[PDB]
Amino acid sequence: TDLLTKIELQAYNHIRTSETKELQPRIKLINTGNTPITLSEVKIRYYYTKDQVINEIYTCDWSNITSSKITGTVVQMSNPKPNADSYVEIGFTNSAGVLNPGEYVEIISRIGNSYALSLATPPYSEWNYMYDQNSDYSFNNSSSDFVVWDKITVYISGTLYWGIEP
Ligand SMILES: [Ca+2]
Ligand SMILES: [Zn+2]
Ligand SMILES: [Zn+2]
Ligand SMILES: [Zn+2]
């Protein structure tokens, strides 16, 4: 048909140190087509290797649509690839609404051991909260602000609409 569904995904890592106690992917999903997209149908995946980190949780610190409309889950991959044995899957609630052409959602996230994300000393050996980021498929070690980024994937109703799987 003659109304195109199209998106662009921009992202960067807000912490780019080789080791981190929190993954900080920041993502901007933009509707660049001319069809509205129902947000609850959209899933975004940030792929990484969990290394020896435990108690992994997701939190959304902020979104331009507010964090209560955002969902995030940490998923272990049944079929791991090099640099990808886990992904953070970010989604939207049933009542998140519609992303019209020209609109965007921005999502600021933190992922890590629940005890590290509280900014208190985790009661663990370092390896149980410190990630290695260069072993993470979706990690961008350089950009200090949003860039178009092909290594985070986006699905609408289960179909891949953006990005390259690991
Ligand atoms: Ca890793
Ligand atoms: Zn900053
Ligand atoms: Zn260290
Ligand atoms: Zn592959």
From Swiss-Prot:
Binding locations of Ca(2+): T49, D51, D132, S135, D136
Single Gene Ontology MF annotation: metal ion binding
Gene Ontology BP annotations: carbohydrate metabolic process
Main localization, broad class: membrane
Subcellular localization: Cell membrane
Domain CBM3: 3-166
Entry GO CC: plasma membrane
Coiled coil (UniProt feature): none
Keywords linked to the UniProt accession: Calcium, Cell membrane, Membrane, Metal-binding, Transmembrane, Transmembrane helix
Subunit structure: Interacts (via RsgI N-terminal anti-sigma domain) with SigI2.
Function: Anti-sigma factor for SigI2. Negatively regulates SigI2 activity through direct interaction. Binding of the polysaccharide substrate to the extracellular C-terminal sensing domain of RsgI2 may induce a conformational change in its N-terminal cytoplasmic region, leading to the release and activation of SigI2.
UniProt name for this protein: Anti-sigma-I factor RsgI2
Species per Swiss-Prot/TrEMBL record: Acetivibrio thermocellus (strain ATCC 27405 / DSM 1237 / JCM 9322 / NBRC 103400 / NCIMB 10682 / NRRL B-4536 / VPI 7372)
Range of the intact protein held here: 506 to 671 of 671
